[PDB]
Structure formats: C-alpha cells, structure tokens
C-alpha cells in the first residue's frame, strides 16, 4: 500500500518555454517608429 502526494516545478531552465514568449511580435513591432518620437521631442525641445 502506497499513498502520498508530491508537487514538482517545471524546471524552467529546461522546460517552461515552449510558449509564445510575448516578447516577440511586439519587439519586432513598432519599437523603432515609436522610438522615432525623437522628432516630436526635438520639436518641443526647440520651442522649450
């Protein structure tokens, strides 16, 4: 007769990925043109 309970991690070093990793599809996304708001910042700084 054996009766006990255990809980184990998903060892995220090995497993834990295999997902979408929402970094991508957003880092390759507008991060450049949104950064390009340097144009507007320069505009406001000129009149500042």
């Amino acid at each position: 007769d054996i009766n006990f309970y255990t809980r184990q991690v998903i060892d995220p070093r090995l497993c834990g990925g295999l997902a979408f990793s929402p970094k991508l599809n957003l880092f390759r996304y507008l991060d450049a043109m949104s950064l390009s708001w340097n144009r507007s910042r320069l505009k406001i700084s000129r009149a500042t």
């Binding site: 991508l24 880092f27 390759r28 991060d31 450049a32 950064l35 340097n38 910042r41």
Partner: protein
C-alpha cells in the same frame, strides 16, 4: 538729497567710456536610442540595444 542727486548724476553720466563683456558656447549631446536588430535568416533571434 542734493549729494544723492549729484552722485546719481555723475554716475549715470560716467558710463560711456567702456562697453564690453564676455561670452560662452556649449556643445551638448543627448542619446535616447533604442535600436533593434534581427539575426537575419533567424527572425526569432534578435538583439536590442
């Protein structure tokens, strides 16, 4: 009062002899560049600077 007036008058009269001063210039840079690069042929691999 007359001494104050004559002192003010002589002071305000004696200015024309000299007129000159200094100047200065600055050179400043601001960096707010957040750049992205892709490992070409491997779009998953990517680097942010």
């Amino acid at each position: 009062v007359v001494d104050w007036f004559v002192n003010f008058g002589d002071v305000i009269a004696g200015f024309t002899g000299g007129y000159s001063d200094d100047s200065g210039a600055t050179a400043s840079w601001r960096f707010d560049d957040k750049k992205v690069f892709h490992l070409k042929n491997i779009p998953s691999a990517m680097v942010i600077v």
